[PDB]
Amino acid sequence: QPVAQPTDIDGTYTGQDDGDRITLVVTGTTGTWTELESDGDQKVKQVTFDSANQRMIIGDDVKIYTVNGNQIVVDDMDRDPSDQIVLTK
């Protein structure tokens, strides 16, 4: 039951996940997902966006994403509400 997403979503979205700042840079159908830890280290993962099936892969972890204007909402596959991450550009 995937809802297809807008295909043009270029930009830089930020938000929080477990107190770490997330920065998602999107270009075309790919991007980078960067997690800033409290000590200043960053973890950078490659992202790919599958717009027709509403899937975003970061590194090799599969998420569901939803685009609402400047906001991208990232969910686990089970849609666990406590794992939801909202990013905004």
Next chain:
Amino acid sequence: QPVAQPTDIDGTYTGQDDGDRITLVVTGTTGTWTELESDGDQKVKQVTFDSANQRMIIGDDVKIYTVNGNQIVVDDMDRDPSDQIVLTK
């Protein structure tokens, strides 16, 4: 470095993986990946095809796929040659 794949690849592809028969049924941008074990049980996983980034997700495992006419070649992300699966319709 993803090469974009043809978007119309409907059909039923079969092959082998570790002596199990794989049957991949593709419809639009989704499909089912079925593994037949030697005892007759089957394992069925949902598949999604991301054509622009050349990614296929089965269940929640990420693969790279390549379409050559009636043949679909499925690779691990590291492209380990011993993990390659060739399916044909």
